[PDB]
Structure formats: structure tokens, C-alpha cells
Amino acid sequence: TTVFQGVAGQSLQVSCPYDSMKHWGRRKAWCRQLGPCQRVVSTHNLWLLSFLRRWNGSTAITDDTLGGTLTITLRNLQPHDAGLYQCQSLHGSEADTLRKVLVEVLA
Amino acid sequence: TTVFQGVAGQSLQVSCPYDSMKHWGRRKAWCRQLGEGPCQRVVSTHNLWLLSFLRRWNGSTAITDDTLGGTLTITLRNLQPHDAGLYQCQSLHGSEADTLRKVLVEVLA
Amino acid sequence: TTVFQGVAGQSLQVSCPYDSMKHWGRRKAWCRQLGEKGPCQRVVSTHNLWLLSFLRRWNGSTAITDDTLGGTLTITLRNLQPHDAGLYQCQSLHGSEADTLRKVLVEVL
Amino acid sequence: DTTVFQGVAGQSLQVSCPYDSMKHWGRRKAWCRQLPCQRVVSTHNLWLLSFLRRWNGSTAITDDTLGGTLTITLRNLQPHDAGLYQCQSLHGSEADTLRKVLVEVLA
Amino acid sequence: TTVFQGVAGQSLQVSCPYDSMKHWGRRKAWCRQPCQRVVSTHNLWLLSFLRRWNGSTAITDDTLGGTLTITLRNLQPHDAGLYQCQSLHGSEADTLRKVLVEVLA
Amino acid sequence: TTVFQGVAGQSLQVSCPYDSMKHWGRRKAWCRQLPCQRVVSTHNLWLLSFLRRWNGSTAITDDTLGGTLTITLRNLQPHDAGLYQCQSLHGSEADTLRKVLVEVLA
Ligand SMILES: CCCCCC(=O)OC[C@H](COP(=O)(O)OC[C@H](N)C(=O)O)OC(=O)CCCCC
Ligand SMILES: CCCCCC(=O)OC[C@H](COP(=O)(O)OC[C@H](N)C(=O)O)OC(=O)CCCCC
Ligand SMILES: CCCCCC(=O)OC[C@H](COP(=O)(O)OC[C@H](N)C(=O)O)OC(=O)CCCCC
Ligand SMILES: *[C@@H]1O[C@H](CO)[C@@H](O)[C@H](O)[C@H]1NC(C)=O
Ligand SMILES: *[C@@H]1O[C@H](CO)[C@@H](O)[C@H](O)[C@H]1NC(C)=O
Ligand SMILES: *[C@@H]1O[C@H](CO)[C@@H](O)[C@H](O)[C@H]1NC(C)=O
Ligand SMILES: *[C@@H]1O[C@H](CO)[C@@H](O)[C@H](O)[C@H]1NC(C)=O
Ligand SMILES: *[C@@H]1O[C@H](CO)[C@@H](O)[C@H](O)[C@H]1NC(C)=O
Ligand SMILES: *[C@@H]1O[C@H](CO)[C@@H](O)[C@H](O)[C@H]1NC(C)=O
Numbered sequence: 001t002t003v004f005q006g007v008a009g010q011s012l013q014v015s016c017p018y019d020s021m022k023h024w025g026r027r028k029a030w031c032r033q034l035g036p037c038q039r040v041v042s043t044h045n046l047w048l049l050s051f052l053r054r055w056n057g058s059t060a061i062t063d064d065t066l067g068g069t070l071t072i073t074l075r076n077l078q079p080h081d082a083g084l085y086q087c088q089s090l091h092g093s094e095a096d097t098l099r100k101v102l103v104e105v106l107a
Numbered sequence: 108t109t110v111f112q113g114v115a116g117q118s119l120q121v122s123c124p125y126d127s128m129k130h131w132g133r134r135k136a137w138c139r140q141l142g143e144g145p146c147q148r149v150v151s152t153h154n155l156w157l158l159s160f161l162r163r164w165n166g167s168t169a170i171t172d173d174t175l176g177g178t179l180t181i182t183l184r185n186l187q188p189h190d191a192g193l194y195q196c197q198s199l200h201g202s203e204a205d206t207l208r209k210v211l212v213e214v215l216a
Numbered sequence: 217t218t219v220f221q222g223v224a225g226q227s228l229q230v231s232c233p234y235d236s237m238k239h240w241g242r243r244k245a246w247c248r249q250l251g252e253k254g255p256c257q258r259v260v261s262t263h264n265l266w267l268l269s270f271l272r273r274w275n276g277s278t279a280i281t282d283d284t285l286g287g288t289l290t291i292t293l294r295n296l297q298p299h300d301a302g303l304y305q306c307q308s309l310h311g312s313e314a315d316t317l318r319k320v321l322v323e324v325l
Numbered sequence: 326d327t328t329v330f331q332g333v334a335g336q337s338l339q340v341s342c343p344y345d346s347m348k349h350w351g352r353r354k355a356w357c358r359q360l361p362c363q364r365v366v367s368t369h370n371l372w373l374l375s376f377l378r379r380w381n382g383s384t385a386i387t388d389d390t391l392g393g394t395l396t397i398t399l400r401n402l403q404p405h406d407a408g409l410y411q412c413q414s415l416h417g418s419e420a421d422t423l424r425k426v427l428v429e430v431l432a
Numbered sequence: 433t434t435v436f437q438g439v440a441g442q443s444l445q446v447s448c449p450y451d452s453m454k455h456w457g458r459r460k461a462w463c464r465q466p467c468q469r470v471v472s473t474h475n476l477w478l479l480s481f482l483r484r485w486n487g488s489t490a491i492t493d494d495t496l497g498g499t500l501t502i503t504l505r506n507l508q509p510h511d512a513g514l515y516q517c518q519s520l521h522g523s524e525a526d527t528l529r530k531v532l533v534e535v536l537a
Numbered sequence: 538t539t540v541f542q543g544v545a546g547q548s549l550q551v552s553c554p555y556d557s558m559k560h561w562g563r564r565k566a567w568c569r570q571l572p573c574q575r576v577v578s579t580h581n582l583w584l585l586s587f588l589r590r591w592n593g594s595t596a597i598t599d600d601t602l603g604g605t606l607t608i609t610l611r612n613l614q615p616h617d618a619g620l621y622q623c624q625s626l627h628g629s630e631a632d633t634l635r636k637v638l639v640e641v642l643a
Contacts, residue, residue: 007218009218009233010218010220010231011231011233011288015337021443021501045127052175053283054176055178055285056124056176056178064378066380066494067380069400071337073286075231075286075287076233076288118237118238173285176285226328227341227394271602272392273603274391274392274600276552294392294394295343295394347598350589369496377496379496379497380494380497381449381497381499391587391600391603
């Protein structure tokens, strides 16, 4: 369950490697454990345009489906952003965990 | 119904998330709901849906739409008591409208 | 003031957040604040066409791209050397005035 | 010469190589590992599309020929990735070293 | 011949690199040893990235980077053998790689 | 005027900034004063301005997005020293962008 450390007021990049054949054709999402893991942002609904950056407030997501890497950007990282999060692979109504991330905010 | 509060004289930003695939191609509106009952148009996104990013104004209220992320943003520039109220974020189609969000704008002195 | 540090000889990525509505429609610049609150000297600016702000512009060993939807300006100092150390400003241009978005100390390890 | 890049294990590491854009105008580039240096990945065969990201396994490369920067991404960096590498500029059968790089990995 | 070995009842991913300019426009095929076709990439070469199936074997092609990927799903001892990656042009088929697939229980 | 100084025998790189909007669509030239004799111009197709053009051991290339014109003086000699112009062409005329003084040393 990986640790990503960032400087406060700067953009923190979170990277989630995944098996690109096993998760072929699947949309991804980023969520924050609140309890339940609640949806922050997801990749483009059109899987062939997953490379396109999608924003939700101060979080962005982009997916490189060929290389099998999902990147999340926490813009303007604030101490209130520290906590547990998940990269997930979507399919049907299910979500599989690609990676569990702890975010920490320095100073 | 979610409350958005801001101080008088400062910009208040209201956000309405929406499912961007479901609302693909649909213009959006911000309107004042008096009654259960008349919904009065304040401002709408550009007539050309590919230009929905363009910031459109009525008086001191602005609206822009990020159609890719699925976020409508309404800005109430110099928030005053007469802005307080119940509002709708709507998705337009024909002369119909679906309600994306109900918002209460409150003003703090 | 926020501090970004990097290793000499490698690229250093600086990012400046801003309010995308407040500075809607504006070009950005990165400049070096050469002493006092005296001369802030232009290093690089975003594309002359605001709708093309996402295109990387180079001046010398500095690049810039703006994400006007997320409200984040990104500056790349290629091949960072001790001479690049110092105080800089991300700015928003309007008319021929400039507002400071953020002050950045570049430190070189 | 040799520059050092450290990155954390299980996260993506970005290596950058500056070069002179006039001196290497028109040339393709490559990234290789010292074991002599074995090719890991090269830039697009069409020089005008050097900006396009190319993968080979867990390594990617892209070239900004205007700015004179070659970027190499080591995805899901593993302790076995530690070692010595070169950025090179290709002309006919010859490969000029742009930079020697040491990759270190951490906890 | 390169050797690819996988645990039985799991996915084995075989990779065949090739020169992307040299094989520009060419579909590929995965064949078993005469070589008997198992699966080939999409008829429309601009969709070579699409995964095509024959039973539990898949094929997908990255024509930009020059990597052909064959996946053998739920690998079994009866998948063990000698196979070919090929590049089709006309009714010709040129050998890109010989691959030895081996299974462990 | 701006001075670019390079050591004998090595390539010297002269850069000329310009406003890319103002000079949109226009070819550029490097010319040498004695009256200014033209040495090399950017490609006749402006969309191909990035193309390194030559005349002997002088190269010209233009970045029309950033507004940076780049002249290369390869194998620099003592006689390459003196006065030059970066110019922007339009119809018959030629606006000056920068006057460049090149000094050598060894
Ligand atoms: C840089 C090259 C990429 C091409 C850039 C490009 O095409 O813009 C992407 C758009 C942006 O998405 P929408 O604004 O439609 O939102 C709704 C959307 N359903 C969503 O999930 O966000 O997506 C399309 O649906 C385009 C259709 C055809 C495109 C070929
Ligand atoms: C995204 C913006 C620009 C995108 C540019 C674009 O239009 O397509 C990208 C392709 C990539 O080609 P391949 O990588 O499949 O071919 C293998 C290759 N020979 C190699 O070395 O990898 O370039 C061409 O060969 C066709 C030229 C078309 C003219 C543009
Ligand atoms: C990759 C996605 C879109 C990419 C947009 C695109 O197609 O071209 C990029 C150019 C930038 O390059 P120029 O060398 O022409 O710089 C001149 C510089 N623009 C200046 O003004 O200083 O934009 C335009 O001029 C406007 C035409 C494009 C209109 C869409
Ligand atoms: C953005 O994230 C918040 C959770 O903090 C959520 O309420 C909202 O629906 C999200 N918006 C989109 C478009 O996914
Ligand atoms: C501005 O909004 C008011 C409702 O508050 C409405 O009467 C008027 O028509 C609107 N103006 C425009 C230009 O839509
Ligand atoms: C690049 O810097 C020079 C000053 O060195 C200046 O004339 C030019 O305008 C700059 N370019 C941009 C894009 O700001
Ligand atoms: C990928 O790596 C393999 C062997 O390590 C090689 O055969 C292939 O050509 C490489 N690809 C590139 C694009 O250099
Ligand atoms: C699927 O596999 C078998 C050989 O393993 C082959 O005989 C059959 O024809 C294949 N299907 C196609 C469409 O080639
Ligand atoms: C090249 O530049 C020289 C400078 O000696 C000039 O005299 C000549 O006319 C130019 N001609 C060609 C063909 O490049």
C-alpha cells in the first residue's frame, strides 16, 4: 500500500502501474477512503480517449492504456488532502483495486 | 438541495457536476426557482455547444461548462442579498429541462 | 512564496495554481524578480492565442504550458544550473499590467 | 559526466537528458543499459514525430527536439532497474553519448 | 527461439518485438508448429491495437512501438509447444520470432 | 545591438527573438553589413520554417511558435567577425529584428 509524499501548495503526481492486458478496455477511477471508498474522478467514458486529462475540482486523472500506467494529479496539495485513497479498474458495477495510496503532505 | 454560502461583496462559485456522457450535446442553464412552479432563466451556456467553455454573463452572474469533466460552474460575482434564493442547474433539450442540481444560495453579512 | 528545489543538470518542474475564473481569458508569464519589488524580467510567456495555452512555448532553456481548465500553469527549467536560482513570479497578463499569481524560489541542490 | 536519478520503488521515475538541438538536429535518439550498452528503446523512426511516446516493456521515451530534451520514463521502478544507462544520438551506425545516467532505487 | 514460461491455469503474455517501419501496414499472425494459424491481428491495419481472440488465445499489436503481444489465457500443458509470430504480406508470411511455450503445473 | 562571441573553430549560435503574432506568415533572413548582403533565408514555405536552411557554413532555422530565430555559424573564423542583421521579410521589404555584432577569440 504505497506512500506518496508531497509538498504543500504544490502539485503531487500519483502513478498506478497496472497489467494492460488484464485491464484492457476498462475505465479507471480514483477514490478517497472516508469507511467506504468514495469516487473523486474517473477516466474518459470513451476508453480510446483515456489519455485525455479529466478534472474534478483540484484532482485530475489521465490513463496511458498502452503502457499500463494511470496518473493522478492532486493540484495545490493541502494538509486536508492527506489520507488513504485507491486507484481502481471499473467493470460492470464492480471496481477492483489496482493500488492503495497513502498521501502525505509535508510543509 | 445543497447550500452555497458566501460573504457579501465577494465572488461565489457554485459547481454542478453531471454525467458528461449522458448530457453530451446539451446546453445548460442557471435559473431561479420561485414556486413548487416557475423557473426563471438567469443565464445559459453558449448556443454553440462546442463553445460551452465560453463564459457567458447576465449582469454579474457568469456560467461556464466543462463538458469533458462534467462540471458546470456558475460565478455570482459581487454577491448581494438579492442573489439569495433557490436555484436550478439544468440540462436543456428541445424546450424541456432536466434538473442537474438544486442549490440554495445564502448570503452572509 | 513557495520553494521548488531541484538537482543541477536535471529538469525542474514548477507549477503555479490559480483561480481559473478570476484569470479567465488571460495569458500568463514567468519572470525573474531581479532585486527588491523592482524589475521583474520576463523569461517566458504563454501562447499569444489563449485557446492554444496548452501548447509548450520555449524561450532558451525555459518552457511553459498553461492548463486553463484546471487552473495550473506549469514551467519547466531545462538543465537546471546554479545560475537559475532566485525568486520568480508566475503572472497573469491583462492590458499591459500583470498580477502576481505566485512567487517561487528556485533552489538548486 | 554521469548524472544521478533516484526514484522510489513501485513508482514511475522520469529521467531527462538535455542536448544541443542544432548539433543533433535531425537525429533519432535511444536509451540503453550498460550490462557494452544494449538498446532499451528509441524515438520514432520519423524524426518529425519524435514527440510521440514509444514504449518497450516498462520503459518509454519521447523527444522534444525543439527544446533539446529527451525524456525517458521508467515505469514501476524496481531495484533490478538500478544501474548505468546512456542517452544517445543516432547517426548512421554511430551512437554519440548524450549523457550517462545512474539510476538508484529506494524504499 | 526464445522461451516463454508460465504457471498452468494463469495468463502467459508472449511479446514479439519487430521493426515498426519495416512492417508498416502488415497484419501479424500467431501460428503453432507446418505452422497452423491460431490467430491474426485485425483485418483493418489501423485497428491492429484491437484484441482478437481464438478460444483462450489473444493477439494485439502496438504498431508504433513495434511490439506484438499474444496472450495465452488459462495456460495448460496441452498449450506447450513451438509457435511462430509472423508478419503477413500477400499470402506470404515472414517469421518474426520462434517462441517456445513451456508450462509449469 | 547585441554581441555574440564564440571561440574560433567551434559552432556559434545566434538567437533572434521576435513577436510571433506580429511576424506571422513572414520569412526571415540573416544578412551581413559592409549596405547588408543577404546570406541565407528561411524556407520559402513558411509552414516549413523549422527547416534548417544553409549557405556554406551558415545555417538558419526558425521557431515560429515561440518567436525565436536561430542562426548557426559553424567552423567560426576571424573574418566571420563584424556586423549582421536578423530580418523579417514582407513583399519587397525587410524589417530589422536585431543587429548582431560577432566577435571571435582564441
Ligand atoms: C488530442 C486528440 C484527441 C481528440 C480530442 C477530442 O475529441 O475531444 C474529446 C471529447 C471531449 O469529451 P466531451 O467534451 O465529448 O464530453 C463527454 C465525454 N463523453 C466524456 O466522457 O468526458 O470527447 C468526445 O466525445 C469526442 C468525439 C469524437 C473524438 C474522436
Ligand atoms: C498525435 C499528433 C500527430 C500524430 C501523427 C500521426 O498522424 O500518426 C502517427 C503515426 C505513427 O505511426 P506508426 O507508429 O503506427 O508506424 C511506425 C513508425 N514508422 C515508427 O517508428 O514507430 O505516424 C506515421 O507513421 C504516419 C504519418 C502520418 C503523418 C502525420
Ligand atoms: C494540437 C491541437 C491544436 C494545435 C493548433 C494548431 O493547429 O497549430 C499550432 C499553431 C502554433 O504554431 P505557429 O508556428 O503557427 O505559431 C504562431 C503562433 N500561433 C502565434 O500566434 O504567435 O497555432 C496557430 O498559429 C493558430 C492555428 C491553429 C488553429 C486551431
Ligand atoms: C468530484 O468529487 C466529489 C467528491 O469530493 C464528488 O462529490 C463529485 O460528484 C465529483 N464530480 C465528478 C464530476 O465526478
Ligand atoms: C437576466 O436574468 C433575469 C432574471 O433574474 C431576466 O429577467 C433577464 O432576462 C436575464 N437577462 C438575460 C440577458 O438573459
Ligand atoms: C524571450 O526572451 C527575450 C528576452 O531574452 C524577449 O525579447 C522575448 O520576447 C522572450 N519571449 C517570450 C515569449 O516572452
Ligand atoms: C524492445 O526491446 C527488445 C529487446 O530488448 C528489442 O528487440 C526491440 O527492438 C526494442 N524496441 C525498440 C523500439 O527499441
Ligand atoms: C482456432 O484454432 C485452431 C488451431 O488451434 C484452428 O484450427 C482454428 O481454425 C482457429 N480459428 C481460426 C479462425 O483460424
Ligand atoms: C550565399 O551567401 C553568399 C555569401 O558569400 C552570397 O554571396 C551568395 O549569393 C549566396 N548564394 C547561394 C546560392 O546560397
